[PDB]
Amino acid sequence: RFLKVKNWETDVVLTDTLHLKSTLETGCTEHICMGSIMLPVRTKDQLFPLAKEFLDQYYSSIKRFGSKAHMDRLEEVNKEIESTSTYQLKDTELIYGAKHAWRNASRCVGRIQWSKLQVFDARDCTTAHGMFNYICNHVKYATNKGNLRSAITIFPQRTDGKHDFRVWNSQLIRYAGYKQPDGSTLGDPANVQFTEICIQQGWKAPRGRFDVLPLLLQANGNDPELFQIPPELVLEVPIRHPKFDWFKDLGLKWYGLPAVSNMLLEIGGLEFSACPFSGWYMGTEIGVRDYCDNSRYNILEEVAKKMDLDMRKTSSLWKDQALVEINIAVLYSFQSDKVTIVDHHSATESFIKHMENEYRCRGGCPADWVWIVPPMSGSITPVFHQEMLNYRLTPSFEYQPDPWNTHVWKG
Amino acid sequence: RFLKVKNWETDVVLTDTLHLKSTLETGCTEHICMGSIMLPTKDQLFPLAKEFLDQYYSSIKRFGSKAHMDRLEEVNKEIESTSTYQLKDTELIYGAKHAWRNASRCVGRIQWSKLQVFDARDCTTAHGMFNYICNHVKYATNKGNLRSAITIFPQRTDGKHDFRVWNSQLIRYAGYKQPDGSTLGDPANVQFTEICIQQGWKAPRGRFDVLPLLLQANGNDPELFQIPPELVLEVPIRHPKFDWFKDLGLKWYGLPAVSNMLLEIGGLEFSACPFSGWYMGTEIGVRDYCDNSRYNILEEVAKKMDLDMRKTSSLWKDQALVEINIAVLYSFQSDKVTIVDHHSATESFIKHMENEYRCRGGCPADWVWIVPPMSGSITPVFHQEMLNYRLTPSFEYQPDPWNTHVW
Ligand code: HEM
Ligand code: HEM
Ligand SMILES: Cc1cc(N)nc(C[C@@H]2CNC[C@@H]2OCCNCC(F)(F)c2ccc(F)cc2)c1
Ligand SMILES: Cc1cc(N)nc(C[C@@H]2CNC[C@@H]2OCCNCC(F)(F)c2ccc(F)cc2)c1
Ligand SMILES: C[C@H](O)[C@H](O)[C@H]1CNc2nc(N)[nH]c(=O)c2N1
């Protein structure tokens, strides 16, 4: 069956046939839509079909579907599963899989880039120290002195789920949060709980507004260990505004490298529980969410205070006014320092072109509208007007619960 | 089956039970989500009638009583004999208020129960429709102190005698396409405007020409009526800081009045049921003024502000967007015409959600529509999870009549 999507600004109509390869469930039914819900040990039995399915896709992609090379590999994976209860991906399959998990990430507006991804194979890793070294190399390679390059590092897969590799940090680079006795927070309020564990684990906290957290790393199901990323590896940008000279005196900065470390990569039925990836920022992630969420740095009042805005009625749109200037500043600062960044206009336009190309080549592009639309100026970006179909393809990236709720402490 | 919704900013978690009384289908399956798609007999009628009267009698604390069982019989007999039935005034008022209560796409529902219902089921001609609508417009406008209202024309019968308002809103501006190649006025209404001219309208060919009503009574060919100019309250648009703003020549109308929708109460279809409240500023300032396919005035405003338009990363569109919206709000307030800003409206709606959760067991809500088209994440609705489902009585969208009329 065919499904259509309309763009209401252009009347372009696209046809989705790809949704027919979708296995996993959405959380939605014919009676309820859960499109805005943030969150809506394997057997031999269930593994070979998922392996088979994936290898069929891989072999099609490289135009060898049905070849002797394809059949032999099905055979070989077959045997490995019956004998060992799992299997190992060839390099070429890991690369392809990691790329396709990004291609299939419906919440990611950055996917025009999906085919340029540096895959770092770290399946030979055995210790947290080893993980640390692999992660440092990732950071240095991705950062590339401000000319950011997309990369992912893939640590060994789940075996019995008693031996998981996990990166406890939600991103490789993030600032500490310190809840004070008066109830105010110092630094990033999102990271308070994680900061507390780091400190409990022996970290000596500087206790300022922008202290880069230590990595907390779990290898082979062991208790995790602290490591400080070398500071010369952590590229940071001080935030200033092109016209407002007082902006720098707010004392803001942000890190250049967005690097998601808490997700689970699934390929051919195997689960990679530590697979930190990175690209570059869209300016709104920092300027809207990180700086302006009430539960984050929450700088709207102080910025509007300094801009002498009428702050006595919401209808002066003082919040909206300060929001734009902060986002101007973020982009200005990154650009002035030659750190890769993309504005939300450019990102969404690029994404619409990617989406259209995907419909032509692939028969679809799963997209989560709730996430794709930027969190400022929604309707002046072309994605606002774009109907999207959301569905789940594998390979995929999935959220996993924070590991401190699940970890069996060895002591 | 007991579903939770989380606010990610306040950590408030609410439990939804109301969705289990959901009746209609969303267009989502367990395989595909269609959350962002704009458009996803006597035997059939009696269960629909019963389900409604059951909720009605429960709402008046009279469920399963003498009066309840009696009405159910009477309606059953009327259906069996006549193939439809008629609502009591009380049922109609309740039906209408609830349709708005159930509108998951509507941010303003904190107001749902203050709805003035105008019963126009005794209407029989287009001229009568025009009279009823003028009266609605004047009552709702109220010299700027806007009051919510709906006017309900006769229900569908065999479907060949439908009442319809051909306009999508009671008050909208004309759109004309020029030899130039571009568009004069509102480009969303080009098609409607040509039909008007085609049926006889003497268009002034300006930028802001209030369209005539095209009213169809009892399935007949529709007819043109100009709304009395003195009944259409308009607002000239100025900026509190920018002198030059006024000279853009911008105005908007004070009364948002949706007139193309279909009201379903207890299985009965009211295909002409124009309703109105008051505007959230973003509807005009963001959508009407700034959509590429609408008046699209970002490019011209950015220029007057002397901003750097060379590159998208200067955020000139965004800068101009805010000031445009400051201007819409300032003007309406200065002219004493009811308007709400998106901060205030979304805050109220979170209050509304919590009342509905604790009082009703939920509140169906479509996040894609509730979050404003500017500054999403600084309004509290962005961070609020919502469950979208279809409750009845309801408003449903209907195809433009000119697609589906026998001329
Ligand atoms: C290259 C530049 C990239 C840009 C500009 C970009 C942009 C974004 C944005 C704005 C989001 C929304 C989520 C949020 O706002 O926190 C997102 C989500 C996501 N991206 Fe991308 N992204 C990029 C690269 C990548 C890469 C390299 C990968 C993986 C290989 C990736 C995978 C994902 C996934 C899995 C999500 C969902 C995240 C979650 O569920 O928390 N992205 N992206
Ligand atoms: C009183 C102030 C009101 C406010 C501030 C308000 C606000 C809104 C907004 C912002 C939307 C989004 C639709 C769009 O962007 O075009 C909407 C949709 C809607 N509203 Fe409300 N509204 C109000 C009154 C009413 C009333 C009186 C009714 C019915 C009696 C109603 C029923 C609906 C319906 C059915 C929709 C969806 C319309 C569609 O599908 O196109 N609203 N409203
Ligand atoms: C509950 C929950 C579920 C889920 N899937 N995810 C979360 C992380 C949230 C998403 N929103 C805020 C926070 O995630 C913040 C980090 N997100 C960065 C990114 F994914 F957008 C990204 C990745 C790579 C790039 F190169 C550029 C950007 C929470
Ligand atoms: C295709 C389609 C489907 C659908 N359901 N609807 C449409 C009208 C579009 C939707 N979105 C913008 C435009 O409709 C503009 C009119 N909307 C006004 C309102 F509904 F928001 C409203 C009603 C009463 C008030 F007091 C205040 C506001 C098109
Ligand atoms: C409740 C709602 O789904 C939630 O706040 C979402 C909305 N859209 C988002 N979009 C992005 N890119 N990132 C987010 O964290 C969110 N949060």
Ligand SMILES: C[C@H](O)[C@H](O)[C@H]1CNc2nc(N)[nH]c(=O)c2N1
């Ligand atoms: C495709 C998408 O659903 C469409 O552009 C929607 C998005 N959200 C909206 N939200 C509101 N309030 N009104 C609209 O017209 C739209 N349009």
Ligand SMILES: [Zn+2]
């Ligand atoms: Zn859905």
